[PDB]
Amino acid sequence: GLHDDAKRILLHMNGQGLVPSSKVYTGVIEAYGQAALYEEAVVAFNTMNEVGSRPMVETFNSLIHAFAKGGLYKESEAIWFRMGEVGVPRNRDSFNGMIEGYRQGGQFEEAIKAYVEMEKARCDPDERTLEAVLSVYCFAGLVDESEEQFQEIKSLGIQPSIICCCMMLAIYAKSERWNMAHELLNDVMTNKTSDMHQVIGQMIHGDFDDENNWQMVEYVFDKLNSEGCGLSMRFYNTLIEALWWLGQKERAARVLNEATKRGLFPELFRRNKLVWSVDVHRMWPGGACTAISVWLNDMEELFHKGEELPQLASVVVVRGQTEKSSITRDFPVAKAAYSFLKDTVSSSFCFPGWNKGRIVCQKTQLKRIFS
Amino acid sequence: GTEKVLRLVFMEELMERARNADSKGVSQVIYDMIAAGLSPGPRSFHGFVVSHVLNRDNDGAMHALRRELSEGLRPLHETFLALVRLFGAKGLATRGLEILAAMEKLKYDIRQAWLVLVEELVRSNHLEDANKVFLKGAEGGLRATDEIYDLLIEQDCKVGDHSNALTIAYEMEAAGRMATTFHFNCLLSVQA
Amino acid sequence: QPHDTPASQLELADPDFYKIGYVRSFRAYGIEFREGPDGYGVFASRDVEPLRRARVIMEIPLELMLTISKKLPWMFFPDIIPVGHPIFDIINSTNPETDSDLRLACLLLYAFDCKDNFWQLYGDFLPSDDECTSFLLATEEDLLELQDEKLASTMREQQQRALEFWEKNWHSAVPLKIKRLARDPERFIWAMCIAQSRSINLQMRIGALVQDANLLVPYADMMNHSFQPNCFFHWRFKDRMLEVMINAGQRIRKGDEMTVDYMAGQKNNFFMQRYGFSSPVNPWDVIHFTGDAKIHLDTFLSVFNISGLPGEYYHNSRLSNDGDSFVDGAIIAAARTLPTWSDGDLPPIPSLERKAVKELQEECHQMLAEFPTTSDEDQKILDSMPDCRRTLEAAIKYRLHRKLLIEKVIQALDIYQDRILF
C-alpha cells in the first residue's frame, strides 16, 4: 500500500531509461488506489494508455477494486462499460469489486441483477462472491432474510470467517434482538474454527484490557499483515462496526490508534492551518460515527489549549462525480452521519451549498458548540 | 456568498507558496481544497504548474498538465506559455511542437507561443532546431516580429550558416518586410 | 414581409447621384447608396461569400477627383489650374509641412468656379453649413460645452488661423478671379471643413512617377468609419482609377454597411478634431492614471479572452463567445491603457491585485466626478433635443462616450476582481 516509494521507484525507472511494463503501472494503480489518491491512479492509467502498452485484464480488475474502495459507482459503471468495448472478458474478481463498490454505496437493486448475470455467464461464484452476496442483505433492513447465504456457506464449506460473524452480530444488535444474539456470540467462541478465531471474541467480551491482557491481541493484530491490505482493513472495519454499535464506546474506537500506528488507515483526519477535516469516505456508518466522535474529541481537546480554529471544518463522507447531486443523502453512511451529527451535537454542522457531499461547519459556528 | 470568501483564502496561500518555488505546499493545498468539496480550477492548477516551472522541472510540469487535462478542463494560455518556455530553455524542441499542437486543438492561437519557443531556443544555444521550428511555423501562414527576423539572421551569419539565413530572408521579403542593409551585410559576411 | 436589415431603415438615394457619375467612367458593383438623417452611406445588395481574393465594388477614375502633392513641387495631376492664374500664388505661399488642408480648400474653391467640371454637379450632394459635423463651423458656447480645455483651445486656434488666412489672402486689392471664389469668409471655412473631413492620403502612380498626394475622391467619402473595416482603397495605375475592395476572407451579407478605416491607430480626440466624429468602442483611446497601483497583464488578457500580441489584440470568440459579450473595443483599450506589470512567469497574488483594483476604481471615481455633469443627465439631454445643432450633438456624444468608457473600465475591473478566483 506504499505510495511514495512507488513514486520514487517510477522516478528512478524513468531516469534509467527503460519504459515501465504492464505490471509496473498495474501495481502503481493499486498503490495509488488505497490512499484515497483516486486522481493519481486515473492519470497513471492514462499514461499507461499513452505510452505504448495495452492494458490486460489484471489492470482492469485492479482498477475496479481501486475505484470500489471509495464507493464511486458511476466510475465503476464507466470502466465496466469501457471494458466491454476494449475487448476483454469480465472475470470473477471484476464482479466482486463491482458488488463491493455497490455495497458501501447505494443502488442495492443492481447487486442481485449483477449476481444473476454472473449465474448466466457461469462465473463460478467463489467464496468472496458468496460473502458479497450475503453482505448485499446486510446494510439493508433484511436481518432475517440474510440467513440462506449463511446456511449455504455452512453447508458448501466451513463456517464463515469472523468478518461475517461479527457483521451478522452487529446486524442482530441493530434490531430488537439483544439477548437472543448472545448464544450466537458464544457459538463463534466455543466452536472448532481456526486458532486465531478463538481468541477473537474474548477481546470484546469481559474486560481483557490492561498492560498485559490487551498485549495478547497485539500478536493477532500484527500477524494479519499477510493479507496485504485486502481484508485487513475490512477486518478492522467490521470489528469496529460490531464493537461500537452494541458495547463499550471507549473499548471499540481504540483500535483506530494502533491501526494508524500500523499504517493501514490513512487520511482519517486532515490537520492544517486553513483546513481541519475528517475523511470517512472508505468507512462504514458505524466506523464513520466512531471516526466522527474521535475527531470531535480531538478537536475539543485542542480548543482549550489556545490554538487558531480552522476556517472550515469538513467531514468527507462521500466523494466522486456523484458529489454534486441531490441523490447523495441515499448513501448508507450519509443517513447515519447526518443522524449522528444531528442528535449528538447541536445544529451547527450542515451540508454545503457548493458541494452536497460532505458536512461543514463555519469558524464562528464551531466555537459556539465548543464552549 | 461565502464561496468566494473561502476561495480567496484557498488561492492566496496557494499563490504565496508557489511564489517561492515550493511544489509540496501547493500539492497539499490542492489536496486540502479538493477534500473540502470544491473542484479545482485552472487558476489553482496554474500555481501547481508554475511551481515546477520555476524549479526547472519538466516531468513534474507534464504530470501537472496531465492532471489538469484528466478532469476535463482546458488549461489556460499562461500555463501553456510557461510550458513552451521551459521546453525551449532546456533545448527540448521536439517536446514543444506537441504542446503547440495541443494549444491548436484547444482553439487557441499559437503565434506568441511559437515566437517564445523560437526565441528561447535561440537564447539557449540551440540554433538548428530553432531554425527548423521557425521554418515549420512560417509555412503555415504565421508571420514573425522584426526582432526575431533580425536575431535569426544575425545568429545564423555569426555561426556561418548561409542556407537558413537566406531562407529566412526570402520568407521575410515574402511576408512583407523588405531587406535592409543590415541583412545584406550579414549575408555578405558569410559569402566573402 | 420586408427583411429586417440595418440598411432597410434608410431610403434609396436620388438616382441622379449615380447618374452624374455613370456618364463618366464610374462603376459600382454590388453596392447601393442610401441616404438617411446622418447622411449618405454605402450598403451591400448581394451576399458576398468568403472569397480567396479581394472584390472591387467601386471604380473611380482620376479625372473626377482633385490631387495635390505632399512634397515641395506642387503637381496637380488633374490639370485644372492654368498657368498664370493668381490662385497658385495663394497655394504656393503656404508651409509645406503643417497646413495641407488650405491648398485643398483653395483647389476646391477654384473647381467650384470652372465649367465642365464634375464638382459643379457633385457639390449639390456635399453637406451644407447646417448638416456638417465639423467643429470649425461651431460657436463658443458649444466649444465651452465640450468640457475639454485642450480640444477647445486647439479648435479656437484653428478657427483663428483659418480666418487670418482668409483675411490675409482675400484682401480688397485682389483681382476678381480670386474674389469670386470665396466672397464671404464663411465660404472659405466651409471649404476647409470639407477638405479636412473628406481628404484621403494615398500613394498614387501615374506613368513613371510614384508620389504621395492628398486627394478628394468622390463617391468614396460616403464610406463610413469602423475600427473593424470591411474595405480598403487601392490604386490601379494601368487605368488611373481608385478602387474600393472588400477584404479577402470576410463574409458580407445583404444589407451590411460597407466601411473603411479613417486614421487607423489614432486617439478619439483627433477624430473629433478632424472629422467631428466620436465612437465609444474606440480600441485606442487613452485613459491617464496617476496612481502607482499596477494590475497584472497576462491574467487580465486571459480572463477576457484577449489573445494576441500587444500590437494586435482581438477577442477570440472561439474560446468564449456567448460567455464574453462584454469583450468590445472598450475592454481592449482598457487593457492597452491600464498600468500593468509582468515579471516573467511569476504567478500573481490575489491580495495585491485585490488592493490594486480598489485603488484603480477610486481613481476612476475621482476622475469621473471632475466633470460637472453625470451620465444619465447627458443621456437625457441628447434625446431631449430632437433637432439641434450638429456641433452640440457631437459634443454631448463625445462626453457621453468618455463617461461610458470610464464606466466600462470600472465594470471590467469589477469582473476581473470577482472572476480571478474561480
Side-chain angles (χ1 to χ4, degrees), chain A residues 1-3 6 8 10 12 15 17 19-22 24-81 83-108 110-121 125 127-157 159-178 180-191 194-320 323-367 369 371, chain B residues 1-16 18-55 57-135 137-142 144-179 182-189 191-192, chain C residues 1-2 4-7 9-18 20-31 33-214 216-269 271 273-291 293-317 323 327-350 352-357 359-361 363-372 374-392 394-406 408-417 419-422:
Chain A
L2 314 169
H3 49 87
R8 302 162 188 175
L10 277 184
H12 197 269
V19 47
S21 64
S22 180
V24 178
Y25 281 103
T26 318
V28 166
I29 60 183
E30 224 289 327
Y32 283 158
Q34 294 293 151
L37 303 174
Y38 311 97
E39 276 290 338
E40 285 182 332
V42 172
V43 307
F45 183 58
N46 289 130
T47 53
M48 184 187 184
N49 309 326
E50 218 77 44
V51 75
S53 179
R54 201 271 178 177
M56 59 181 60
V57 194
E58 183 68 23
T59 71
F60 300 150
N61 54 66
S62 176
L63 283 176
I64 182 59
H65 291 188
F67 298 153
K69 188 62 178 61
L72 219 181
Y73 76 99
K74 176 58 184 177
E75 189 179 26
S76 300
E77 294 178 358
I79 64 178
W80 194 275
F81 188 85
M83 286 175 58
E85 270 64 25
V86 75
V88 301
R90 34 189 54 89
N91 39 9
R92 320 159 79 177
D93 52 1
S94 59
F95 289 93
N96 176 267
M98 180 214 297
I99 272 64
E100 175 62 30
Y102 270 98
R103 276 304 92 203
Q104 56 180 345
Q107 195 65 24
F108 308 98
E110 196 70 20
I112 182 61
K113 269 62 184 178
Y115 184 64
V116 86
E117 288 292 338
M118 302 179 218
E119 296 292 338
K120 288 299 181 180
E127 178 266 1
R128 293 291 290 100
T129 60
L130 268 62
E131 184 274 341
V133 172
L134 187 145
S135 301
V136 165
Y137 300 88
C138 93
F139 286 147
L142 296 176
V143 182
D144 47 318
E145 283 72 15
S146 58
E147 285 293 334
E148 49 92 3
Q149 298 294 149
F150 204 91
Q151 185 271 349
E152 294 292 337
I153 292 294
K154 292 184 61 180
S155 300
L156 276 67
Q159 297 182 357
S161 51
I162 310 180
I163 66 179
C164 305
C165 301
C166 72
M167 182 185 303
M168 297 304 300
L169 177 132
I171 292 169
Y172 303 151
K174 192 177 184 301
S175 298
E176 36 82 47
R177 185 146 74 96
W178 172 76
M180 287 67 64
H182 280 265
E183 53 94 0
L184 299 174
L185 169 62
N186 305 332
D187 199 334
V188 80
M189 299 185 300
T190 54
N191 49 7
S194 178
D195 50 356
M196 296 301 180
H197 296 179
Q198 179 64 26
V199 66
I200 298 178
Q202 283 72 214
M203 59 180 60
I204 160 182
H205 194 271
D207 190 66
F208 208 79
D209 51 354
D210 50 63
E211 69 282 349
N212 188 25
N213 199 329
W214 198 256
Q215 193 180 0
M216 180 181 180
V217 307
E218 176 267 355
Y219 306 95
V220 187
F221 288 163
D222 61 55
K223 67 101 185 60
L224 45 80
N225 60 329
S226 180
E227 278 69 18
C229 300
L231 281 71
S232 175
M233 302 179 61
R234 299 171 52 91
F235 180 81
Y236 287 159
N237 198 331
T238 54
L239 182 65
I240 268 65
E241 291 294 325
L243 252 294
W244 184 89
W245 194 253
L246 253 301
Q248 185 70 16
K249 49 180 57 59
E250 293 80 10
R251 185 193 189 93
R254 200 66 276 176
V255 195
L256 287 79
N257 197 332
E258 69 92 9
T260 53
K261 294 300 180 180
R262 181 81 161 276
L264 304 177
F265 279 79
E267 285 65 284
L268 286 191
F269 57 96
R270 178 75 280 181
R271 181 60 178 93
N272 199 331
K273 175 60 184 301
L274 58 145
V275 76
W276 190 358
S277 173
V278 41
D279 167 68
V280 294
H281 181 46
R282 315 180 313 275
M283 203 62 178
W284 288 358
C289 297
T290 60
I292 285 179
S293 301
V294 168
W295 182 79
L296 175 63
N297 55 70
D298 289 352
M299 185 270 299
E300 294 296 333
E301 69 179 0
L302 268 64
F303 174 78
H304 61 261
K305 56 172 51 58
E307 187 67 23
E308 173 64 28
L309 45 88
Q311 285 73 11
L312 186 65
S314 180
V315 179
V316 186
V317 48
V318 47
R319 215 147 158 171
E323 261 173 350
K324 301 190 176 307
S325 288
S326 320
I327 339 177
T328 46
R329 214 207 163 269
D330 304 345
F331 279 78
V333 50
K335 307 147 181 165
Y338 189 23
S339 301
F340 195 87
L341 290 173
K342 190 176 182 179
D343 76 329
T344 55
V345 304
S346 61
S347 300
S348 179
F349 294 83
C350 61
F351 287 87
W354 51 86
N355 193 331
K356 303 173 300 180
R358 41 194 42 78
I359 308 293
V360 299
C361 183
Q362 301 295 144
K363 15 188 173 182
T364 313
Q365 300 177 355
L366 79 89
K367 196 173 183 179
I369 176 68
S371 54
Chain B
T2 60
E3 300 82 5
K4 282 78 60 180
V5 182
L6 53 86
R7 282 190 171 274
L8 187 144
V9 302
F10 281 166
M11 192 170 299
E12 186 272 345
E13 51 198 348
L14 184 146
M15 297 302 182
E16 201 280 335
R19 178 182 178 91
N20 53 44
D22 198 332
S23 177
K24 302 301 180 180
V26 183
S27 64
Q28 69 91 5
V29 168
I30 290 182
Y31 281 149
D32 295 2
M33 72 176 183
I34 66 178
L38 295 95
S39 177
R43 300 295 172 91
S44 60
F45 283 152
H46 169 53
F48 191 71
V49 172
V50 77
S51 298
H52 303 76
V53 167
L54 291 181
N55 295 122
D57 195 322
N58 59 90
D59 41 317
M62 270 293 188
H63 192 189
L65 176 61
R66 284 181 290 269
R67 170 104 64 176
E68 180 174 8
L69 185 59
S70 299
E71 295 112 16
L73 215 174
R74 48 200 302 267
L76 301 178
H77 184 272
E78 174 63 25
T79 62
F80 276 143
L81 187 62
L83 294 182
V84 169
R85 179 175 293 101
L86 179 132
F87 292 160
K90 293 296 183 179
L92 300 177
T94 178
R95 296 184 181 271
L97 275 68
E98 51 184 2
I99 303 299
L100 293 183
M103 297 178 60
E104 181 67 22
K105 74 176 182 178
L106 293 181
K107 302 304 177 180
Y108 271 84
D109 54 329
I110 57 177
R111 181 181 177 181
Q112 184 178 184
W114 169 65
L115 300 182
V116 171
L117 178 59
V118 300
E119 182 179 0
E120 293 298 329
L121 286 181
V122 170
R123 293 187 60 180
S124 180
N125 297 121
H126 284 275
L127 275 307
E128 184 68 22
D129 49 331
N131 294 127
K132 287 198 297 293
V133 172
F134 187 85
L135 294 184
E139 296 179 359
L142 300 180
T145 326
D146 299 0
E147 51 94 2
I148 287 182
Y149 274 135
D150 298 330
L151 179 62
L152 284 173
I153 289 187
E154 180 179 0
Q155 294 296 335
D156 293 3
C157 296
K158 185 177 300 180
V159 172
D161 199 325
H162 187 282
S163 304
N164 293 122
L166 195 58
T167 306
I168 292 177
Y170 284 157
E171 294 292 337
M172 175 202 306
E173 285 194 338
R177 184 195 181 190
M178 297 181 180
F182 174 64
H183 306 146
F184 272 112
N185 289 14
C186 289
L187 272 49
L188 274 169
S189 162
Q191 300 177 334
Chain C
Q1 62 281 354
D4 190 7
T5 55
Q9 61 180 1
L10 307 185
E11 65 280 355
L12 185 61
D14 199 31
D16 185 70
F17 177 80
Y18 182 79
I20 59 179
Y22 188 84
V23 293
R24 280 83 174 183
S25 180
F26 176 83
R27 296 298 178 269
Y29 313 112
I31 247 20
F33 290 96
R34 290 242 237 194
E35 182 182 0
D38 52 354
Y40 295 93
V42 182
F43 302 99
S45 61
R46 181 174 58 183
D47 300 0
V48 181
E49 62 98 16
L51 298 175
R52 303 173 58 92
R53 301 181 181 272
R55 175 177 294 182
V56 189
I57 69 182
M58 293 185 184
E59 295 182 359
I60 315 168
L62 176 64
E63 56 179 3
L64 269 58
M65 49 188 178
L66 310 178
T67 294
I68 304 181
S69 61
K70 299 176 57 181
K71 296 305 178 181
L72 182 56
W74 314 105
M75 278 202 63
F76 317 92
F77 285 162
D79 195 334
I80 58 180
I81 297 187
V83 184
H85 198 282
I87 197 59
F88 182 79
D89 291 355
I90 300 181
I91 294 182
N92 191 23
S93 60
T94 56
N95 202 20
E97 54 90 13
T98 178
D99 41 349
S100 61
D101 53 77
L102 305 181
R103 300 183 291 273
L104 269 66
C106 296
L107 187 60
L108 184 62
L109 289 181
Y110 181 82
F112 276 157
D113 195 68
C114 177
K115 62 173 184 178
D116 66 277
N117 198 336
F118 182 83
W119 287 90
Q120 287 191 349
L121 306 179
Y122 188 85
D124 302 330
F125 296 94
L126 293 178
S128 179
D129 59 330
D130 297 358
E131 58 183 0
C132 183
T133 59
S134 178
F135 266 74
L136 286 181
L137 286 75
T139 59
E140 182 67 23
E141 180 268 353
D142 170 64
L143 264 53
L144 184 60
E145 195 267 353
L146 255 178
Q147 300 179 345
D148 197 333
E149 300 294 335
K150 182 244 298 181
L151 178 55
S153 179
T154 53
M155 294 315 300
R156 278 172 289 189
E157 207 286 280
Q158 194 167 353
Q159 293 179 181
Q160 227 280 123
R161 182 175 64 96
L163 286 177
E164 193 276 340
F165 187 85
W166 178 87
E167 290 180 1
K168 185 180 62 61
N169 293 89
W170 274 261
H171 55 69
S172 299
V174 72
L176 190 56
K177 303 179 185 180
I178 310 183
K179 186 180 299 299
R180 63 180 177 180
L181 303 179
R183 311 185 67 89
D184 300 330
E186 190 271 346
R187 190 74 178 277
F188 195 86
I189 295 181
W190 177 83
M192 281 181 55
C193 102
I194 292 301
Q196 185 173 347
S197 179
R198 297 195 181 277
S199 64
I200 293 184
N201 300 20
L202 183 61
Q203 177 185 196
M204 57 173 57
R205 168 188 170 186
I206 62 156
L209 183 56
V210 183
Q211 70 170 26
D212 46 350
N214 313 322
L216 295 168
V217 47
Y219 302 94
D221 304 329
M222 304 305 182
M223 306 287 296
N224 294 20
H225 176 52
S226 294
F227 301 93
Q228 298 180 179
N230 305 335
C231 300
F232 66 99
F233 307 104
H234 185 54
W235 178 262
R236 183 198 302 184
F237 67 98
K238 287 294 184 180
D239 299 331
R240 290 194 260 263
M241 294 191 301
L242 190 143
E243 304 176 19
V244 179
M245 302 193 300
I246 315 177
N247 289 328
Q250 187 168 2
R251 186 173 184 178
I252 300 300
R253 57 183 64 259
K254 183 178 181 180
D256 193 6
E257 181 179 2
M258 296 294 191
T259 52
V260 297
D261 201 329
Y262 296 151
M263 298 166 48
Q266 290 292 341
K267 201 184 304 179
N268 201 16
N269 183 28
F271 278 86
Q273 179 177 353
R274 256 187 177 269
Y275 294 89
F277 187 89
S278 180
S279 181
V281 296
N282 195 326
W284 294 93
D285 42 11
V286 182
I287 308 179
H288 192 184
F289 286 166
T290 179
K294 300 180 179 300
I295 203 178
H296 197 75
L297 179 59
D298 204 308
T299 304
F300 196 92
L301 297 180
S302 180
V303 63
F304 285 109
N305 298 115
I306 303 180
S307 60
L309 274 69
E312 193 273 333
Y313 282 153
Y314 70 87
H315 129 80
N316 211 351
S317 136
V327 64
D328 53 353
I331 176 61
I332 298 182
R336 289 177 182 171
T337 193
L338 281 175
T340 56
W341 72 272
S342 184
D343 196 333
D345 301 330
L346 179 135
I349 297 92
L352 277 308
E353 57 89 13
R354 189 61 56 90
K355 195 262 181 179
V357 59
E359 180 68 23
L360 264 58
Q361 288 181 9
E363 204 283 335
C364 293
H365 281 299
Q366 75 177 359
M367 77 178 182
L368 183 59
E370 296 291 339
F371 298 155
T374 64
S375 178
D376 194 10
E377 295 186 20
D378 297 330
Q379 181 66 27
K380 190 61 182 61
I381 287 180
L382 72 88
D383 55 353
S384 180
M385 302 299 180
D387 297 324
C388 60
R389 302 175 186 176
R390 310 305 294 266
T391 63
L392 184 61
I396 62 189
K397 268 186 173 300
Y398 175 78
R399 293 166 48 187
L400 178 77
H401 292 163
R402 200 70 177 92
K403 293 180 177 58
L404 261 56
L405 178 63
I406 296 180
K408 198 77 169 183
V409 169
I410 294 180
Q411 185 175 178
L413 289 177
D414 293 325
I415 295 299
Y416 174 79
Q417 75 171 343
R419 204 176 296 181
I420 189 181
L421 314 176
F422 179 80

